[PDB]
Amino acid sequence: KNGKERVPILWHFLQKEAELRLVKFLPEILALQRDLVKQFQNVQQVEYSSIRGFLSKHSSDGLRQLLHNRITVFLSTWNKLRRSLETNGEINLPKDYCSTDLDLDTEFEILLPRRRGLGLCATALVSYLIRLHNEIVYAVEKLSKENNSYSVDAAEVTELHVISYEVERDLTPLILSNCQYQVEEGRETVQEFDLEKIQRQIVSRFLQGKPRLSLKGIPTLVYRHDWNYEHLFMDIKNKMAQDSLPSSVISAISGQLQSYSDACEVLSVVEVTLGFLSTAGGDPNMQLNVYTQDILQMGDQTIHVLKALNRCQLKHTIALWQFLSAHKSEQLLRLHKEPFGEISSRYKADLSPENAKLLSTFLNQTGLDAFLLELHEMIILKLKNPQTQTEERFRPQWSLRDTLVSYMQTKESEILPEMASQFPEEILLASCVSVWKTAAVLKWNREMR
Amino acid sequence: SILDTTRLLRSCVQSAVGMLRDQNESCTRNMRRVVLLLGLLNEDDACHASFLRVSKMRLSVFLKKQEESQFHPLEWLAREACNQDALQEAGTFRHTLWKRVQGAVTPLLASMISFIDRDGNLELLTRPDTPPWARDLWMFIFSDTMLLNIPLVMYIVVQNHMNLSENASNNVPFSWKIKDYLEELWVQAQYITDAEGLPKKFVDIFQQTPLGRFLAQLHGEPQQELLQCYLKDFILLTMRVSTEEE
Amino acid sequence: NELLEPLKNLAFSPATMAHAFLPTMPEDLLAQARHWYTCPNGHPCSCIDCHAPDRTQTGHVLGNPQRRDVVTCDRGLPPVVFLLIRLLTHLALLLGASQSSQALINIIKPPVRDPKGFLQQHILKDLEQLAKMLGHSADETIGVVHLVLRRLLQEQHQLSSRRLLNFDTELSTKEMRNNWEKEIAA
Amino acid sequence: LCLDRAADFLSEPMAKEKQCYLQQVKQFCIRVENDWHRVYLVRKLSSQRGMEFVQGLSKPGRPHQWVFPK
Ligand SMILES: [Zn+2]
């Protein structure tokens, strides 16, 4: 009966009904996921066997049975939708995940809607409601002639917002009441469905609301061993301005900090400041010692820090961290101690004679200070963490020049002419520690001379 | 005593807070946390003394739980003496040990701060207009280890449940934990008991709990005020409200 | 007729249709849409939660028919017409399974031990859904199927010319299959 | 509608309540003698299962022979 034009809302509703009926569940699934987040949030390791194991652990009879009910709702909904999610959903899903139906023996991770692993399924299902509801809401909006339908987020989600209908209880009586019949003398009875009125009643009853989103993030903390300072640096730079250390200030700190301990102490104060600034921020021109002493109240543990940082300001903080870290390692190298114990030996490959001559030539005609600082920051952030092992886009076989240029670009740092032109491509990422060591030895020789 | 744990906590307050990230992106939070904890970590008033004591006790609990996973936890000094890296970072052995203890305590202190100061909690301890019953309930909850269960942890996210404005806090301490507790008790009573008799069984179970007996100590207007405050926090926890009239 | 050649291959020469796109297919709407973005490493994003700022399958991919309570087709065609296309396709596949089962085992994903019975079950579910949609008896429904096959047989040399319909006899791609579907529907 | 419900219960390829309802329908059909009621039932069965199903029920050794008229 030309419904897509004449009755688009009813058309789309009838198409998606099979799945739209499942929209009523997702407030419950959202509550479940909210409590799961609350329980596991700020946790990093998950040693749970499966959903059956998890339930047995939280075997408090009331809580066990409520969890079981919610989990069963989730599993039913997932089992139905999974074959649609494999094609639709806007969230990609390995075929194995959607392939088979799930049961209590299924891995527990399936219920935590992490943005990776089996939790994508919990995310996908939550997303696939949101499309369906939204899409039919769009259908209604396009015919409401209004542009202010109030939105809502996945936290406030309640049964009042979702499109909750029961086919037999709600819909079938509607159809049967709209289904009308006609007769004429000598002619058979024929139906004539009041399609417009079906649409209007469905709209009046079920259709309103809008959800948005909510969930955790896997990287909960990347603490000391794998700490991702790069994220902190980028957050700060977004929040406030940053600047490099003037060579004067560099030389002053170098003269003051003639001991690894003092370096470490200053650096610990810098790390605290970095965390705070990344969260809060501050005036880039504020002197760092005034900041630590007045605001953070970092007294009682600041003896020579205050004299070294007497000139430095918050904008220098990142550059100061980098200087301190490299100076810290440089001191170790001066004493022949290994500064890169946290680095994989694979990244500590040697430099062949040809590549040694090439590197020596580049370094003689290079900005040795900036080169040393940048290569050190690259090694320490990228090549240090086991976490950066599991993301192996920094393979020893990758070239060093392109890697370092990529890094510098990601932080929108200024490119030195030597980086593209003079830097030899023949040097890979495995010699990076030999490269830094050679550069620091040449610097140390230049300084002793 | 052997060690000035008050000073160690005060030294670790900044490092711990630096571990804390908020969902609502309340930039002005960590600074106020630092001010509040440095003010509270004292023995000036009985409330500060109790807060400090409970902090130490819970730190002891966390550290003992961790120690139950480690070999020869008495040998920690020796292990530090074997960490040339920590030695040379610190210079003096005494500072090495101090740093060791600070590193052990900072994660746990950050965790505890995340639990206690979730929405705006700590404003209640320091704000002078906070009634006595509010501080007493704050410390009662904080002292309890089975009601305010704080699991270990091995970017810490402070799960702010309300959309509260900064400079404002939950009108009832740990309103979120109390709500969770009463909901667990509702579930237990509901499944144990029929739909009729569930109210009485739920009220009785609560009254038999530590918090029920505590609030039973509160009589008269304080309890009425507590109930009003809890209603308000209950609403904020259940329904998102964009206005104060609503 | 040229329109029948894909089905004739399925039935009588299924080996060729191994990597063929069949109307027995749902497709990735993402490939048509070219909201939720994605990072370079692959984890979704609506920088947030990341620290860093084609699913279309071949062969017969439908699993156990028991799940099929309702029919949906992404290409906007009438569900009845797509159902009939699916039914004709399943009949051709049943014939092929009779000719050589292993070929259909290759074409059916996930694998199966009894392809013919599986296709029988799908056909029966198709008939059930047809009855639901049209509102006729089971036998009247099978009669509708026979009517459609008759139409195709009469529209066999009546399709002599005026025949420029972009599709390959082996249904090598997604557009060939869509085009075959739309012609069949017409 | 009662006959329709019975036709559905029979169409299924096993419950006390269904069986008791079917027995009550059997007794009603036998008692009232208005065989039109069974005509409708046979018709509905044919609609749902097909004529061959009704034929198979008519054959000797069948439990639902009461579905049919005299
Ligand atoms: Zn992601």
Side-chain angles (χ1 to χ4, degrees), chain A residues 409-443:
Chain A
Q409 289 176 346
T410 63
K411 55 169 168 171
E412 306 102 344
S413 53
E414 311 232 311
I415 292 308
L416 304 314
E418 310 98 279
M419 279 308 314
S421 68
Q422 304 192 5
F423 213 136
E425 58 184 36
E426 298 94 339
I427 294 172
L428 328 181
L429 212 70
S431 294
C432 94
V433 167
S434 289
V435 171
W436 191 98
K437 289 185 175 162
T438 307
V441 166
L442 179 63
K443 175 168 168 176

mmCIF file of all heavy atoms in Angstrom, chain A residues 409-443:
data_model
loop_
_atom_site.group_PDB
_atom_site.id
_atom_site.type_symbol
_atom_site.label_atom_id
_atom_site.label_comp_id
_atom_site.label_asym_id
_atom_site.label_seq_id
_atom_site.Cartn_x
_atom_site.Cartn_y
_atom_site.Cartn_z
ATOM 1 N N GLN A 409 56.808 14.107 15.200
ATOM 2 C CA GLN A 409 55.588 14.604 14.574
ATOM 3 C C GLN A 409 54.386 14.443 15.495
ATOM 4 O O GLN A 409 53.572 15.363 15.640
ATOM 5 C CB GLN A 409 55.353 13.877 13.253
ATOM 6 C CG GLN A 409 56.333 14.263 12.157
ATOM 7 C CD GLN A 409 56.136 13.455 10.890
ATOM 8 O OE1 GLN A 409 55.450 12.434 10.891
ATOM 9 N NE2 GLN A 409 56.743 13.907 9.800
ATOM 10 N N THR A 410 54.255 13.273 16.128
ATOM 11 C CA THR A 410 53.111 13.040 17.004
ATOM 12 C C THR A 410 53.015 14.089 18.103
ATOM 13 O O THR A 410 51.909 14.421 18.543
ATOM 14 C CB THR A 410 53.184 11.641 17.617
ATOM 15 O OG1 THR A 410 54.349 11.533 18.443
ATOM 16 C CG2 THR A 410 53.204 10.572 16.537
ATOM 17 N N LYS A 411 54.146 14.622 18.558
ATOM 18 C CA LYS A 411 54.143 15.728 19.503
ATOM 19 C C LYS A 411 54.287 17.079 18.815
ATOM 20 O O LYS A 411 54.562 18.077 19.488
ATOM 21 C CB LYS A 411 55.247 15.549 20.547
ATOM 22 C CG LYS A 411 56.647 15.364 19.998
ATOM 23 C CD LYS A 411 57.658 15.473 21.132
ATOM 24 C CE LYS A 411 59.047 15.024 20.720
ATOM 25 N NZ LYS A 411 60.059 15.340 21.769
ATOM 26 N N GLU A 412 54.100 17.131 17.496
ATOM 27 C CA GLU A 412 54.112 18.388 16.751
ATOM 28 C C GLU A 412 55.365 19.201 17.062
ATOM 29 O O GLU A 412 55.329 20.428 17.166
ATOM 30 C CB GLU A 412 52.850 19.202 17.043
ATOM 31 C CG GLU A 412 51.557 18.432 16.815
ATOM 32 C CD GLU A 412 50.917 17.943 18.103
ATOM 33 O OE1 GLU A 412 51.599 17.924 19.148
ATOM 34 O OE2 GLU A 412 49.724 17.574 18.069
ATOM 35 N N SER A 413 56.487 18.507 17.217
ATOM 36 C CA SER A 413 57.745 19.164 17.526
ATOM 37 C C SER A 413 58.438 19.632 16.252
ATOM 38 O O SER A 413 58.253 19.067 15.170
ATOM 39 C CB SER A 413 58.659 18.221 18.305
ATOM 40 O OG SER A 413 58.801 16.987 17.627
ATOM 41 N N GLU A 414 59.244 20.680 16.393
ATOM 42 C CA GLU A 414 59.932 21.262 15.250
ATOM 43 C C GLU A 414 61.007 20.316 14.730
ATOM 44 O O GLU A 414 61.752 19.709 15.504
ATOM 45 C CB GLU A 414 60.551 22.604 15.635
ATOM 46 C CG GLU A 414 59.587 23.540 16.358
ATOM 47 C CD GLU A 414 59.520 24.919 15.729
ATOM 48 O OE1 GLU A 414 60.588 25.517 15.484
ATOM 49 O OE2 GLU A 414 58.395 25.404 15.480
ATOM 50 N N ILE A 415 61.086 20.199 13.408
ATOM 51 C CA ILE A 415 61.979 19.247 12.758
ATOM 52 C C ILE A 415 63.285 19.943 12.400
ATOM 53 O O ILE A 415 63.286 21.004 11.767
ATOM 54 C CB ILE A 415 61.319 18.643 11.508
ATOM 55 C CG1 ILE A 415 60.137 17.750 11.897
ATOM 56 C CG2 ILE A 415 62.339 17.858 10.694
ATOM 57 C CD1 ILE A 415 60.460 16.696 12.944
ATOM 58 N N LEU A 416 64.394 19.340 12.806
ATOM 59 C CA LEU A 416 65.716 19.845 12.470
ATOM 60 C C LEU A 416 66.129 19.356 11.082
ATOM 61 O O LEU A 416 65.856 18.207 10.724
ATOM 62 C CB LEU A 416 66.743 19.392 13.506
ATOM 63 C CG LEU A 416 66.462 19.746 14.968
ATOM 64 C CD1 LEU A 416 66.027 21.198 15.089
ATOM 65 C CD2 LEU A 416 65.418 18.818 15.577
ATOM 66 N N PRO A 417 66.774 20.204 10.276
ATOM 67 C CA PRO A 417 67.167 19.769 8.926
ATOM 68 C C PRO A 417 67.903 18.445 8.908
ATOM 69 O O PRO A 417 67.729 17.649 7.976
ATOM 70 C CB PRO A 417 68.071 20.912 8.445
ATOM 71 C CG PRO A 417 67.622 22.097 9.212
ATOM 72 C CD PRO A 417 67.232 21.575 10.563
ATOM 73 N N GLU A 418 68.726 18.186 9.923
ATOM 74 C CA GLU A 418 69.516 16.962 9.959
ATOM 75 C C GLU A 418 68.650 15.717 10.054
ATOM 76 O O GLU A 418 69.103 14.630 9.678
ATOM 77 C CB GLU A 418 70.480 17.005 11.145
ATOM 78 C CG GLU A 418 71.305 18.278 11.235
ATOM 79 C CD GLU A 418 70.719 19.284 12.208
ATOM 80 O OE1 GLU A 418 69.783 20.012 11.819
ATOM 81 O OE2 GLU A 418 71.193 19.347 13.362
ATOM 82 N N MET A 419 67.417 15.848 10.543
ATOM 83 C CA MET A 419 66.612 14.669 10.842
ATOM 84 C C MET A 419 66.288 13.883 9.578
ATOM 85 O O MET A 419 66.531 12.673 9.508
ATOM 86 C CB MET A 419 65.327 15.089 11.555
ATOM 87 C CG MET A 419 65.487 15.337 13.052
ATOM 88 S SD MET A 419 66.275 13.990 13.964
ATOM 89 C CE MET A 419 65.415 12.562 13.310
ATOM 90 N N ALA A 420 65.735 14.553 8.568
ATOM 91 C CA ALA A 420 65.417 13.876 7.316
ATOM 92 C C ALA A 420 66.665 13.642 6.474
ATOM 93 O O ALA A 420 66.893 12.531 5.985
ATOM 94 C CB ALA A 420 64.386 14.691 6.532
ATOM 95 N N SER A 421 67.485 14.677 6.298
ATOM 96 C CA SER A 421 68.588 14.606 5.346
ATOM 97 C C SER A 421 69.776 13.835 5.910
ATOM 98 O O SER A 421 70.156 12.785 5.381
ATOM 99 C CB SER A 421 69.021 16.021 4.952
ATOM 100 O OG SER A 421 69.619 16.688 6.050
ATOM 101 N N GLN A 422 70.371 14.341 6.990
ATOM 102 C CA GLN A 422 71.642 13.810 7.466
ATOM 103 C C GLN A 422 71.502 12.488 8.205
ATOM 104 O O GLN A 422 72.469 11.723 8.264
ATOM 105 C CB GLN A 422 72.320 14.836 8.376
ATOM 106 C CG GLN A 422 72.516 16.191 7.720
ATOM 107 C CD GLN A 422 73.433 17.098 8.513
ATOM 108 O OE1 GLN A 422 74.006 16.693 9.525
ATOM 109 N NE2 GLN A 422 73.579 18.335 8.055
ATOM 110 N N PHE A 423 70.338 12.203 8.761
ATOM 111 C CA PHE A 423 70.168 11.000 9.563
ATOM 112 C C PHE A 423 70.229 9.763 8.672
ATOM 113 O O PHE A 423 69.432 9.656 7.731
ATOM 114 C CB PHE A 423 68.843 11.069 10.309
ATOM 115 C CG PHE A 423 68.868 10.396 11.647
ATOM 116 C CD1 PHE A 423 68.287 10.999 12.747
ATOM 117 C CD2 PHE A 423 69.474 9.162 11.808
ATOM 118 C CE1 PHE A 423 68.306 10.385 13.978
ATOM 119 C CE2 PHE A 423 69.501 8.542 13.035
ATOM 120 C CZ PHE A 423 68.915 9.153 14.124
ATOM 121 N N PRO A 424 71.135 8.814 8.916
ATOM 122 C CA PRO A 424 71.230 7.651 8.024
ATOM 123 C C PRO A 424 70.066 6.694 8.227
ATOM 124 O O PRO A 424 69.735 6.325 9.356
ATOM 125 C CB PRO A 424 72.565 7.003 8.416
ATOM 126 C CG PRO A 424 73.236 7.964 9.331
ATOM 127 C CD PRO A 424 72.152 8.742 9.977
ATOM 128 N N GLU A 425 69.441 6.298 7.118
ATOM 129 C CA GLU A 425 68.413 5.266 7.168
ATOM 130 C C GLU A 425 68.995 3.889 7.453
ATOM 131 O O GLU A 425 68.255 2.991 7.868
ATOM 132 C CB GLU A 425 67.636 5.230 5.852
ATOM 133 C CG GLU A 425 68.500 4.984 4.622
ATOM 134 C CD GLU A 425 67.712 5.057 3.327
ATOM 135 O OE1 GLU A 425 66.789 5.893 3.237
ATOM 136 O OE2 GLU A 425 68.015 4.278 2.400
ATOM 137 N N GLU A 426 70.297 3.702 7.237
ATOM 138 C CA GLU A 426 70.909 2.394 7.440
ATOM 139 C C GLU A 426 70.868 1.951 8.893
ATOM 140 O O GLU A 426 71.053 0.761 9.170
ATOM 141 C CB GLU A 426 72.356 2.412 6.956
ATOM 142 C CG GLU A 426 72.506 2.708 5.479
ATOM 143 C CD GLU A 426 72.749 4.176 5.197
ATOM 144 O OE1 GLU A 426 72.421 5.012 6.063
ATOM 145 O OE2 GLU A 426 73.267 4.493 4.106
ATOM 146 N N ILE A 427 70.634 2.868 9.824
ATOM 147 C CA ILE A 427 70.601 2.541 11.243
ATOM 148 C C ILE A 427 69.177 2.173 11.628
ATOM 149 O O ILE A 427 68.238 2.942 11.388
ATOM 150 C CB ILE A 427 71.120 3.710 12.094
ATOM 151 C CG1 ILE A 427 72.608 3.937 11.820
ATOM 152 C CG2 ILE A 427 70.872 3.442 13.578
ATOM 153 C CD1 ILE A 427 73.169 5.177 12.475
ATOM 154 N N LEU A 428 69.019 1.001 12.232
ATOM 155 C CA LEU A 428 67.716 0.507 12.628
ATOM 156 C C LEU A 428 67.438 0.866 14.084
ATOM 157 O O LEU A 428 68.242 1.508 14.763
ATOM 158 C CB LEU A 428 67.634 -1.000 12.411
ATOM 159 C CG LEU A 428 68.440 -1.550 11.234
ATOM 160 C CD1 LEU A 428 68.256 -3.053 11.119
ATOM 161 C CD2 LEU A 428 68.045 -0.861 9.941
ATOM 162 N N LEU A 429 66.274 0.438 14.569
ATOM 163 C CA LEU A 429 65.873 0.707 15.942
ATOM 164 C C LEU A 429 66.631 -0.138 16.954
ATOM 165 O O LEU A 429 66.549 0.145 18.154
ATOM 166 C CB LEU A 429 64.378 0.460 16.099
ATOM 167 C CG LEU A 429 63.650 1.331 17.115
ATOM 168 C CD1 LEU A 429 63.563 2.749 16.618
ATOM 169 C CD2 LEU A 429 62.272 0.772 17.383
ATOM 170 N N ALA A 430 67.354 -1.163 16.508
ATOM 171 C CA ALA A 430 68.084 -2.019 17.435
ATOM 172 C C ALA A 430 69.360 -1.362 17.938
ATOM 173 O O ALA A 430 69.794 -1.640 19.060
ATOM 174 C CB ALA A 430 68.417 -3.349 16.766
ATOM 175 N N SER A 431 69.979 -0.510 17.125
ATOM 176 C CA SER A 431 71.184 0.204 17.518
ATOM 177 C C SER A 431 70.889 1.489 18.276
ATOM 178 O O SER A 431 71.822 2.236 18.585
ATOM 179 C CB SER A 431 72.021 0.524 16.281
ATOM 180 O OG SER A 431 72.516 -0.658 15.679
ATOM 181 N N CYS A 432 69.622 1.756 18.588
ATOM 182 C CA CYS A 432 69.249 3.026 19.197
ATOM 183 C C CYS A 432 70.021 3.298 20.482
ATOM 184 O O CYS A 432 70.448 4.435 20.731
ATOM 185 C CB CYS A 432 67.749 3.023 19.466
ATOM 186 S SG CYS A 432 67.330 2.489 21.117
ATOM 187 N N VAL A 433 70.246 2.268 21.298
ATOM 188 C CA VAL A 433 70.973 2.498 22.540
ATOM 189 C C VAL A 433 72.451 2.702 22.264
ATOM 190 O O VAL A 433 73.101 3.529 22.913
ATOM 191 C CB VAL A 433 70.744 1.332 23.516
ATOM 192 C CG1 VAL A 433 71.729 1.403 24.665
ATOM 193 C CG2 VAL A 433 69.326 1.353 24.035
ATOM 194 N N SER A 434 72.993 2.017 21.258
ATOM 195 C CA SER A 434 74.367 2.288 20.863
ATOM 196 C C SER A 434 74.499 3.685 20.285
ATOM 197 O O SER A 434 75.518 4.351 20.493
ATOM 198 C CB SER A 434 74.836 1.245 19.857
ATOM 199 O OG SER A 434 75.013 -0.010 20.486
ATOM 200 N N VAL A 435 73.460 4.161 19.603
ATOM 201 C CA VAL A 435 73.499 5.496 19.021
ATOM 202 C C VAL A 435 73.527 6.540 20.123
ATOM 203 O O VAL A 435 74.360 7.456 20.118
ATOM 204 C CB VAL A 435 72.292 5.700 18.089
ATOM 205 C CG1 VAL A 435 72.194 7.144 17.654
ATOM 206 C CG2 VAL A 435 72.384 4.787 16.890
ATOM 207 N N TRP A 436 72.605 6.426 21.078
ATOM 208 C CA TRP A 436 72.592 7.353 22.200
ATOM 209 C C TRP A 436 73.901 7.310 22.976
ATOM 210 O O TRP A 436 74.433 8.357 23.360
ATOM 211 C CB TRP A 436 71.411 7.047 23.116
ATOM 212 C CG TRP A 436 71.176 8.103 24.138
ATOM 213 C CD1 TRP A 436 70.265 9.109 24.074
ATOM 214 C CD2 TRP A 436 71.847 8.249 25.394
ATOM 215 N NE1 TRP A 436 70.335 9.883 25.201
ATOM 216 C CE2 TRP A 436 71.297 9.375 26.030
ATOM 217 C CE3 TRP A 436 72.864 7.542 26.038
ATOM 218 C CZ2 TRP A 436 71.725 9.809 27.275
ATOM 219 C CZ3 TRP A 436 73.288 7.976 27.277
ATOM 220 C CH2 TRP A 436 72.719 9.099 27.883
ATOM 221 N N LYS A 437 74.421 6.112 23.248
ATOM 222 C CA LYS A 437 75.684 5.996 23.967
ATOM 223 C C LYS A 437 76.825 6.678 23.219
ATOM 224 O O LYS A 437 77.619 7.410 23.818
ATOM 225 C CB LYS A 437 75.997 4.526 24.218
ATOM 226 C CG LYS A 437 75.078 3.889 25.248
ATOM 227 C CD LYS A 437 75.478 2.465 25.576
ATOM 228 C CE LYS A 437 74.619 1.910 26.693
ATOM 229 N NZ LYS A 437 74.678 0.426 26.756
ATOM 230 N N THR A 438 76.944 6.426 21.913
ATOM 231 C CA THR A 438 77.983 7.084 21.127
ATOM 232 C C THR A 438 77.834 8.600 21.155
ATOM 233 O O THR A 438 78.824 9.329 21.309
ATOM 234 C CB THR A 438 77.939 6.576 19.688
ATOM 235 O OG1 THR A 438 77.995 5.145 19.680
ATOM 236 C CG2 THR A 438 79.094 7.133 18.888
ATOM 237 N N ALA A 439 76.602 9.094 21.031
ATOM 238 C CA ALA A 439 76.389 10.535 21.038
ATOM 239 C C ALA A 439 76.764 11.134 22.385
ATOM 240 O O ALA A 439 77.393 12.198 22.451
ATOM 241 C CB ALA A 439 74.935 10.847 20.700
ATOM 242 N N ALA A 440 76.396 10.459 23.471
ATOM 243 C CA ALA A 440 76.720 10.964 24.795
ATOM 244 C C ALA A 440 78.215 10.903 25.054
ATOM 245 O O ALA A 440 78.757 11.777 25.733
ATOM 246 C CB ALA A 440 75.963 10.174 25.855
ATOM 247 N N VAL A 441 78.896 9.887 24.526
ATOM 248 C CA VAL A 441 80.343 9.816 24.679
ATOM 249 C C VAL A 441 81.005 10.967 23.940
ATOM 250 O O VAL A 441 81.962 11.573 24.436
ATOM 251 C CB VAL A 441 80.863 8.455 24.188
ATOM 252 C CG1 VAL A 441 82.365 8.490 24.019
ATOM 253 C CG2 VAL A 441 80.461 7.363 25.155
ATOM 254 N N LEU A 442 80.503 11.296 22.750
ATOM 255 C CA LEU A 442 81.074 12.417 22.011
ATOM 256 C C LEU A 442 80.814 13.733 22.734
ATOM 257 O O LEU A 442 81.695 14.598 22.802
ATOM 258 C CB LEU A 442 80.500 12.457 20.599
ATOM 259 C CG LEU A 442 80.994 13.599 19.718
ATOM 260 C CD1 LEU A 442 82.491 13.469 19.494
ATOM 261 C CD2 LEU A 442 80.243 13.609 18.403
ATOM 262 N N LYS A 443 79.616 13.893 23.298
ATOM 263 C CA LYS A 443 79.318 15.076 24.099
ATOM 264 C C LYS A 443 80.248 15.173 25.301
ATOM 265 O O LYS A 443 80.765 16.248 25.621
ATOM 266 C CB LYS A 443 77.863 15.035 24.553
ATOM 267 C CG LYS A 443 77.476 16.158 25.480
ATOM 268 C CD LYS A 443 75.976 16.234 25.653
ATOM 269 C CE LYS A 443 75.596 17.157 26.792
ATOM 270 N NZ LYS A 443 74.125 17.313 26.904
#
